[PDB]
Design a binder for this molecule. Structure first.
Ligand SMILES: CC(C)(COP(=O)(O)OP(=O)(O)OC[C@H]1O[C@@H](n2cnc3c(N)ncnc32)[C@H](O)[C@@H]1OP(=O)(O)O)[C@@H](O)C(=O)NCCC(=O)NCCSSCCO
Ligand SMILES: CC(C)(COP(=O)(O)OP(=O)(O)OC[C@H]1O[C@@H](n2cnc3c(N)ncnc32)[C@H](O)[C@@H]1OP(=O)(O)O)[C@@H](O)C(=O)NCCC(=O)NCCSSCCO
Lengths: 308, 308
């Protein structure tokens, strides 16, 4: 009889909350959404993601009445073709934990609902300072840490979108060139649902931050030991993948041998990513609305929901 | 064209948001609710508090649909006589800023609405460890700081109430005896609205805290210089008030002269309360849903609302 803000589910119980929700995704489309190293299949989409999509849509509708109440108080006009306040979803997790895939799969699913919602996906890597500013601030070795992002611009972007602005722009990042793409821009136009995915997104602070504007948040979790192993493996697999293309900022890596690669990946992990995870990311897991616990084989078998 | 999560109002503009809301409080009743040193009159109740009560009730109704959505997702029965999820309001501010009064006035106003809501008020001083445990943990000089409260019990209490438990108990504190009253208990029974008032209430942490369960929060603000002066004045006025009664843990103070008192109050303030304000309380003001800015004369002339 010890009340809790959380409710924990094993996959076998969570799958039942799917109810009647239709599966509108083919094994073909899932393939194009799957990230390097991910093992998600159609069954996992069905037993884990479908009930997630249902939970979200139930909340989107209810969350709108809350903002409408504030609008009615201020006496601000609900004029023209009524445009809903965007619903903002934060997706966080460590590097290589698979949050990229999760965000993409969730977008596809959320968009294929009867009322055809406009669902955008924005990765926060577009707000990392360009390498120039990075090495000009002596932060090239802290890329991924909270200080490597233009927190002001990020906050300004999300505030703009949720305030109901007609359009807002976000910088575009290129993982290949390991840097910001000069002049490139992603345009977001009053979406019904905006999904923001990144390492930092749930970070709280002495000031109001982007996480305070989230209407729902998910954390992609795994044992730190397992994440390290996925990191190292994706690293090796990239030698014949991204590191292959000459433009790659890490071409010199595509040549490494299985032995050197492992030693190289583990250090980058030990000195840069692991510290960031432990110090900045893991501390936000307690506040996430929904935690997705992955197992050694990438499979999500456990979930923790905040009902309070 | 710089979007903001905040909206600032001068009293003259805020007063207009009262709309038709009836004033159901007499100057007589207001007298009994007013704390030592407070200057709140019926006009202030009308121009500042009435629109506040209206904002809250508009939100109470909308907030219920949100929890209902989660309930519908989990497939949990909306059985019997439908009992709403309690709406939790946090009221924070420094010592002597006047938050006690604000909380009491707000309770009275919220309760006198057409549907007769059950509105309870719980001060968190009932969760301060007894002086015994305090001096047993070497914290008697940090009374009021976050470490002086039983954060676990406080969180357990609020979680219990909002989870829908039939009843929950909170310890009772006695300002006179400067300590917890052994055996005394305040019983809270599934209220429609629960108001929690204290110094710590908005504190965030590495773990889920009481502030994460709040549905609305207000911060009672004033210039630190002015708060210091109110502290010192209330102190002097208490010599002939509370410090008079022999039981008072500070009887020896009722004898002090205007000169000594001032020097004594200022040090307690300088060494205990001011530090707590600067280090633990002020840092939470950015997250409060509504900030009430008091002026040197205790009058509230400015407000800052989070519409996002
Ligand atoms: C740039 C930054 C901060 C980006 O963080 P993210 O949260 O986006 O990383 P995350 O693991 O989520 O990857 C997101 C996507 O970005 C992909 N990606 C990551 N690094 C590269 C890359 N170098 N080239 C091409 N694609 C890449 C990754 O495979 C995901 O794509 P898929 O959804 O198709 O699978 C991080 O990857 C980084 O480089 N941190 C500095 C420390 C470090 O790891 N240095 C070694 C760089 S080469 S090893 C590649 C794995 O880090
Ligand atoms: C015990 C504690 C933590 C309580 O914090 P609170 O947030 O409840 O203080 P706050 O200023 O909000 O006072 C709440 C009510 O509690 C009243 N009060 C405060 N101290 C006493 C007292 N000693 N005797 C009787 N009533 C008191 C105060 O007048 C308010 O009543 P009203 O609503 O009728 O005006 C704080 O007052 C304290 O004693 N902190 C330790 C440092 C300190 O100030 N020591 C000097 C104690 S004698 S000076 C009285 C003002 O502090």
């Amino acid at each position: 009889s010890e009340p809790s803000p959380y409710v924990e589910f094993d996959r076998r119980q969570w799958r039942a909350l799917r109810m009647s929700t239709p599966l509108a995704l083919t094994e073909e489309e899932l393939v194009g959404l799957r990230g390097l190293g991910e093992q998600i299949d159609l069954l996992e989409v069905e037993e884990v993601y479908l009930p997630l999509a249902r939970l979200i849509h139930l909340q989107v509708a209810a969350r709108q009445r809350l903002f409408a109440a504030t609008a009615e108080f201020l006496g601000e006009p609900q004029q023209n073709p009524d445009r809903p306040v965007p619903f903002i979803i934060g997706v966080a997790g460590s590097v290589a934990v698979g949050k990229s895939t999760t965000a993409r799969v969730l977008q596809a699913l959320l968009a294929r609902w009867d009322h055809h919602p406009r669902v955008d996906l924005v990765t926060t890597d577009g707000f990392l300072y360009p390498n120039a500013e990075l090495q000009r601030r002596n932060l090239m070795h802290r890329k991924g840490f909270p200080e490597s992002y233009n927190r002001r611009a990020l906050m300004r972007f999300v505030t703009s979108v949720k305030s109901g602005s007609d359009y807002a722009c976000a910088p575009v990042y290129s993982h290949l060139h390991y840097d910001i793409i000069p002049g490139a821009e992603q345009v977001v136009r009053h979406p019904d649902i905006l999904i923001l995915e990144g390492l930092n997104v749930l970070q709280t602070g002495p000031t109001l931050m982007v996480s305070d504007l989230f209407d729902f948040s998910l954390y992609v979790d795994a044992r730190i030991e397992d994440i390290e192993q996925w990191y190292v493996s994706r690293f090796l697999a990239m030698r014949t993948t991204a590191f292959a293309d000459p433009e790659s900022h890490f071409h010199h890596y595509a040549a490494f041998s299985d032995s050197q690669a492992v030693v190289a990946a583990r250090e980058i992990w030990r000195t840069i990513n692991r510290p960031n995870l432990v110090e900045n990311i893991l501390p936000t897991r307690p506040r996430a609305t929904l935690v997705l616990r992955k197992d050694a084989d990438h499979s999500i078998n456990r979930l923790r929901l905040r009902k309070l």
